DNA sequence: CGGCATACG
DNA sequence: CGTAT
DNA sequence: GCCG
């Protein structure tokens, strides 16, 4: 009943196995901190299966036949069901490695490889990194300076304000250009760690060179605390607050209208959903999918899409609205 | 055992 | 290397 | 870690 790919089943934002999925995603995260991408994927997939179930898992037998549940993930669920706690998961939670790798990788500009190297050098805290800025990039200096604000969840109320100011700058950079909210908020999330916008123009070609014009105007308005021709911009915005302001991460992306459906789909996520979707496309349909298009390698042609619905149809998948892509 | 998504800055 | 879903 |  439960299909093997996450793109084949609706996954709502809230579900009936929150505790179980959160435990497996701890192990997925820890696997990533050790470079085990395969293990991370299995744990992520197993967690997502539980998100797609219609009711709580209460007995171990209810895992039989579910894809991506083998000896390891089943044993985690078993201990949680019997004792409300999984020893392996708790061991990871309190490990010095896990805590520090999580703290470091959540810095903007710091990846697993950088965090791992710093950990091997004996570094453990944010103040450790501040004491030696000689080893920090300009991006990492920005992420570290703003780390506190960036750890504060972005609210849906904040998003509307940002979209307004982005549209204002986009409108002056290219009259007629549109701004579309993507990312987790388009999937219905009420909070997020950043805001994701997709920019296009209904006249193919007019979007060329647009993002530098948008960025220059945003900076001149004093709204850019940090930014790097280009089509993706990873910014830190100055977001007004009552009597003050806070730093917020904002991603801006431009696509020509011909590619807009593919870019909307990819940037709406979830991350797991897109990986599963591209995996499904290649392995089950022999088609190559990315945020630019869908390629048939046999005929050497690109599928034209006018909508996300078109893309699901060309992949033989039932359509899923953004709110059901929370894999 | 091979594979595990796929881009851009 | 970082970033993004 | 799990699937095919
Ligand atoms: Mg986001
Ligand atoms: Mg983002
Ligand atoms: Na990071």
Q: Which residues contact A143 (CB under 8 A, 6 or more apart)?
A: A107, A108, A109, A110, A150
Contact between the CB of A72 and strand D at under 7 Å = yes
User: Both A164 and A222 in a single domain?
Assistant: yes
What residues form DSSP beta bridges with A295? A288, A302
Helix (H) or strand (E) holding A296: strand A293-296
Domain that holds residue A176: 153-257
On whether the CB atoms of residues A294 and A287 are closer than 8 A, the answer is: yes
Work out the number of other CB atoms within 10 angstroms of the CB of residue A77.
24
- Return the CATH number at A177: 3.30.460.10
User: Both A137 and A171 in a single domain?
Assistant: no
User: Both A262 and A246 in a single domain?
Assistant: no
b/e A14-29 (16+ beta carbons within 10 angstroms → b): ebebeebbebbbbbbb
Can you tell me the distance from the alpha carbon of A40 to that of A28, in angstroms, rounded to the nearest whole number? 4
What residues form DSSP beta bridges with A234? A251
User: Both A157 and A206 in a single domain?
Assistant: yes
Q: Number of folded domains in chain A?
A: 4
Tell me, in angstroms, the distance from the centre of ligand 2 to residue A196's CA: 5
Question: Of A209, A233, A257, which residue constitutes the final position of a domain?
Answer: A257
User: Both A228 and A245 in a single domain?
Assistant: yes
Among all protein residues, pick the one whose CA is nearest to the C1' atom of C3. Answer: A234
Tell me, in angstroms, the distance from the centre of ligand 1 to residue A92's CA: 26
Tell me, in angstroms, the distance from the centre of ligand 1 to residue A268's CA: 8
Footprint of strand C on the protein (CB under 7 A): A 105, 107-115, 139, 143, 182-184, 194, 196, 232, 234, 249, 251, 266-271, 274-275
Can you tell me the distance from the alpha carbon of A187 to that of A320, in angstroms, rounded to the nearest whole number? 11
Contact between the CB of A68 and strand D at under 7 Å = yes
User: Both A253 and A174 in a single domain?
Assistant: yes
Tell me, in angstroms, the distance from the centre of ligand 2 to residue A71's CA: 35
Tell me, in angstroms, the distance from the centre of ligand 2 to residue A156's CA: 15
Bases of chain D with protein Cβ within 7 A:
1-4
Name the nt closest to A72 by C-alpha to C1': D1
Question: Of A257, A276, A299, which residue constitutes the final position of a domain?
Answer: A257
- Return the CATH number at A78: 1.10.150.110
Consult the annotation and say whether A310 binds a ligand.
no
Experimental method: X-ray
Question: Of A241, A257, A273, which residue constitutes the final position of a domain?
Answer: A257
- Return the CATH number at A134: 1.10.150.20
Name the nt closest to A116 by C-alpha to C1': C1
Footprint of strand B on the protein (CB under 7 A): A 37-38, 41-42, 228, 230-234, 271, 274-276, 278-279, 281-282, 288-292
Q: Is A158 a catalytic residue?
A: no
Is the sign of the CA dihedral A235, A194, A27, A93 positive or negative? Answer: positive
On whether the CB atoms of residues A33 and A105 are closer than 8 A, the answer is: yes
User: Both A49 and A130 in a single domain?
Assistant: no
User: Both A163 and A237 in a single domain?
Assistant: yes
User: Both A157 and A253 in a single domain?
Assistant: yes
Among all protein residues, pick the one whose CA is nearest to the C1' atom of B4. Answer: A38
Contacts 24+ apart (CB under 8 A), A50-54: A50/A15, A50/A17, A50/A20, A50/A21, A50/A24, A51/A11, A51/A12, A51/A15, A51/A17, A51/A21, A51/A326, A51/A327, A52/A2, A52/A6, A52/A9, A52/A10, A52/A11, A52/A15, A52/A327, A53/A2, A53/A15, A53/A16, A53/A17, A54/A16
User: Both A157 and A251 in a single domain?
Assistant: yes
Helices first, then strands: H and E counts in chain A: 15, 10
Q: Is A196 a catalytic residue?
A: yes
Work out the number of other CB atoms within 10 angstroms of the CB of residue A240.
14
Q: Where do we find the tokens 């709502």?
A: A12
Q: Where do we find the tokens 């044993």?
A: A75
Cis peptide before A270 (omega within 30 of 0): yes
Pairing label, strands A301-302, A293-296: antiparallel
Consult the annotation and say whether A251 binds a ligand.
yes
Cα three-residue angle A76-A80-A85, rounded to 5 degrees: 105
User: Both A111 and A165 in a single domain?
Assistant: no
User: Both A114 and A125 in a single domain?
Assistant: yes
Which of A116, A149, A158, A196 does the annotation list as catalytic? A196
């Amino acid at each position: 009943w439960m299909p093997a790919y996450a793109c084949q089943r609706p996954t709502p934002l809230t579900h009936h196995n929150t505790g179980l999925s959160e435990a497996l995603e701890i192990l997925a995260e820890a696997a990533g901190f050790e470079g085990s991408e395969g293990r991370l994927l299995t744990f992520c997939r197993a967690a997502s299966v539980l998100k797609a179930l219609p009711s709580p898992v209460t007995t171990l037998s209810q895992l039989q036949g579910l894809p991506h549940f083998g000896e390891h993930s089943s044993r985690v669920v078993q201990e949680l069901l019997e004792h409300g706690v999984c020893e392996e998961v708790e061991r990871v939670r309190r490990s010095e490695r896990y805590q520090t790798m999580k703290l470091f990788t959540q810095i903007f500009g710091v990846g697993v490889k950088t965090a791992d190297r710093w950990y091997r050098e004996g570094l453990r805290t944010l103040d450790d990194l501040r004491e030696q800025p000689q080893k920090l990039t300009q991006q990492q200096k920005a992420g570290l300076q703003h780390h506190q604000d960036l750890s504060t969840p972005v609210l849906r109320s904040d998003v509307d304000a940002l979209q307004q100011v982005v549209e204002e700058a986009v409108g002056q950079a290219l009259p007629g250009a549109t701004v579309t909210l993507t990312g987790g908020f388009r999937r219905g999330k009420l909070q997020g760690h950043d805001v994701d916008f997709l920019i296009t123009h209904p006249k193919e070609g007019q979007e060329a060179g647009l993002l530098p014009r948008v960025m220059c105007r945003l900076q001149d308005q004093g709204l850019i605390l940090y930014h790097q021709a280009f089509e993706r911009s990873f910014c830190i915005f100055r977001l007004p607050q009552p009597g003050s302001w806070k730093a917020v991460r904002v991603d801006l992306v431009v696509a020509p209208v011909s590619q807009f459906p593919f870019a909307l789909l990819g940037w709406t996520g979830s991350k797991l959903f897109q990986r599963e979707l591209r995996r499904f496309s290649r392995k089950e349909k022999g088609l190559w999918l990315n945020s630019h298009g869908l390629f048939d390698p046999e005929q050497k042609t690109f599928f034209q899409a006018a909508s996300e619905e078109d893309i699901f149809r060309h992949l033989g998948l039932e359509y899923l609205p953004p709110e059901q892509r929370n894999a």
